[PDB]
């Protein structure tokens, strides 16, 4: 049973084209719309088709962002096409993405159910690739705004990670207000809770930090029952912020007096067998002061990731590591001196 559509390639020509696919099955639902799995007739390759209700005459942000992106750690947009329901003006936008069988969420949960901590090698590998994809999108001023384990796709054989769901993503423009109620609660940066509209892409680094901590703990570090409770959970670890940190998070917020709680020591937040380089990295990501957080490229160059730069490293499954050092100049744009750490001798 072949479905055939005129679709437009994700990158390159812009000239439309006939695209055929088969084996259409539902893999995901939600308020966003629907995601299907399907097989391309033309080459057998598996694809995910994200169908979203879209109102012309309006620009879809997700589409425009996805057309810019070509990166090994980002889910690739192969095609897009529009389709109609049958109820007059009922148009759908369809993103044809590369299919990826697993997620960081489902892999972590598998280990958690089997009463195991995820092996540290996988923690290094997943996080490294996340930061690499963040460095890439951030170099275009794009902020993902929804970093969380469910959004990190995984090939279980190769351990390739691909960032997906750009449905909250936005090209940030300094000076132009952005909405505060954004991100999933557990991964939501404290400046967002404080109502900031002048935030930067360092909100993704906070979220990345929450993913790191979660992989080490076997569960979310900040599991708030609500928006207010989310800050409570953060305070149980970071303590209350200083007047200076508050100003850094949201300069349009002031609180003259509040009772001080002290930070909980980072080495007590994690279990004793947690690698100290992992804790060290975490403490540089989960900071109140948005500018005090590591950049994604600085994060890639952290000592926690040194094992990945060793010529001898192997996956527990026996395979070689995926491509880790093939940095383009675009990728290194924000900080060239880091190439010295980031590209190891044996890879030049």
């Amino acid at each position: 049973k072949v479905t055939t559509v005129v679709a437009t390639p994700g990158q390159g020509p812009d000239r439309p084209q006939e695209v055929s696919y088969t084996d259409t099955k539902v893999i995901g639902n939600g308020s966003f719309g629907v995601v299907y799995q399907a097989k391309l007739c033309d080459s057998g390759e598996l694809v995910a088709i994200k169908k979203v209700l879209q109102d012309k005459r309006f620009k879809n942000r997700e589409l425009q962002i996805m057309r810019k992106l070509d990166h090994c750690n980002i889910v690739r947009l192969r095609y897009f096409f529009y389709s109609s329901g049958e109820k007059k003006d009922e148009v759908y936008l369809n993103l044809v993405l590369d299919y990826v069988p697993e997620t960081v969420y489902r892999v972590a949960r598998h280990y958690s159910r089997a009463k195991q901590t995820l092996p540290v090698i996988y923690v290094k590998l997943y996080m490294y690739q996340l930061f690499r994809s963040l460095a890439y999108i951030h170099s275009f001023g794009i902020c993902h705004r929804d970093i969380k384990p469910q959004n990190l796709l995984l090939d279980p054989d190769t351990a390739v990670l691909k960032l997906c769901d750009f449905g909250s993503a936005k090209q940030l423009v300094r000076g132009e207000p952005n909405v505060s109620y954004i991100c999933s609660r557990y991964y939501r940066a404290p400046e967002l809770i404080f109502g900031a509209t002048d935030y930067t892409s360092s909100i993704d680094v906070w979220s990345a930090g929450c993913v790191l901590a979660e992989l080490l703990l076997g569960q979310p570090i900040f599991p708030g029952d609500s928006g207010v409770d989310q800050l409570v959970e953060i305070i149980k670890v970071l303590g209350t912020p200083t007047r200076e940190q508050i100003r850094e998070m949201n300069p349009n917020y002031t609180e003259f007096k509040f009772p001080q709680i002290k930070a909980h020591p980072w080495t007590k937040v994690f279990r004793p067998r947690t690698p100290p380089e992992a804790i060290a990295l975490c403490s540089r990501l989960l900071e109140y002061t948005p500018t005090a957080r590591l950049t994604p490229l600085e994060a890639c160059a952290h000592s926690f990731f040194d094992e990945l730069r060793d010529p001898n490293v192997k996956l527990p499954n026996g395979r070689d590591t995926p491509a880790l050092f093939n940095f383009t100049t675009q990728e290194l744009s924000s900080n060239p001196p880091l190439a010295t750490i980031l590209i190891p001798p044996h890879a030049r």
């Binding site: 809770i193 404080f194 109502g195 609500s226 928006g227 207010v228 409770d229 800050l231 409570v232 305070i235 149980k236 209350t240 912020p241 917020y253 002031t254 609180e255 003259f256 007096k257 509040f258 009772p259 709680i261």
Partner: peptide
Amino acid sequence: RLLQQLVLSGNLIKEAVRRLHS
């Protein structure tokens, strides 16, 4: 609704500490 009000009124931190000591 509630977070929004605490932000605008400047009572967020105060209210969060109180909830932590319950």
